[PDB]
């Protein structure tokens, strides 16, 4: 008891995950008093309760972020934590379209005189 | 390495009545303090004519 697997958590929604988090936190709070009052094999249980709380928090955060990404899928401005990280310099880099933009005179020259494929007889 | 034996702050204690005039590591509170430095004859010092 106290070991909650991620597989069962990935199918729950927010309310039962919150309820499970509440019960796990209550058991850990009682078990700390049990630790300071007596010694036993319940230290394994407190370790599993800590890791189960971590798993539940991870799953709740992941589902909330997935829902938010779905909500912000078709919007121009995203929250800064939902924006891709990359590096600061990569984010300041010119976009691919803007870097590939050429002048129209250049475009006419490239349309009518591109680099050709050729060979020279020996 | 070109910096070997020269990463120390050390000065000679001068002509006197007690010790040889090799430069000695300044400071205190450690075994290195007051010990000889920079010489090819010194422990933890620069070798004669370092290889290039």
């Amino acid at each position: 008891n106290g070991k909650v697997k991620a597989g069962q958590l990935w199918s729950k929604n927010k309310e039962e995950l919150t309820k499970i988090l509440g019960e796990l936190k209550t058991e850990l709070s009682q078990l700390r008093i049990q630790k300071i009052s007596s010694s036993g094999a319940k230290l394994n249980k407190i370790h599993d309760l800590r890791k189960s709380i971590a798993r539940v928090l991870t799953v709740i955060n992941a589902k909330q972020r997935a829902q938010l990404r779905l909500f912000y899928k078709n919007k121009k401005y995203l929250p800064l934590d939902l924006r891709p990280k990359l590096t600061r310099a990569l984010r300041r880099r010119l976009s691919k379209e803007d870097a590939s933009r050429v002048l129209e005179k250049t475009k006419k020259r490239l349309t009518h005189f591109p680099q050709r494929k050729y060979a020279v007889k020996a | 390495s070109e910096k070997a034996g020269h990463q120390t702050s050390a000065e000679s204690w001068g002509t006197g009545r007690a010790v040889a005039r090799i430069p000695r590591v300044s400071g205190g509170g450690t075994h290195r303090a007051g010990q000889g430095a920079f010489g090819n004859m010194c422990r933890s010092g620069r070798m004669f004519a370092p290889t290039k």
Binding site: - | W13, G14, G16, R17, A18, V19, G29, H31, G34
Partner: protein, 50 residues
Amino acid sequence: LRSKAERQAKLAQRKMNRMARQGEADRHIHASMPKHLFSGKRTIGKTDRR
């Protein structure tokens, strides 16, 4: 195992007990050749000590 551990803890103190340290916290390195005692000359004017 407790007896073995206590013996190892006592055997860990032999070098510092030979060096006569007051416990493991005593790591003071004293000046065996102080500069004020091993440099300079006593002139005819002011002296560094009486």
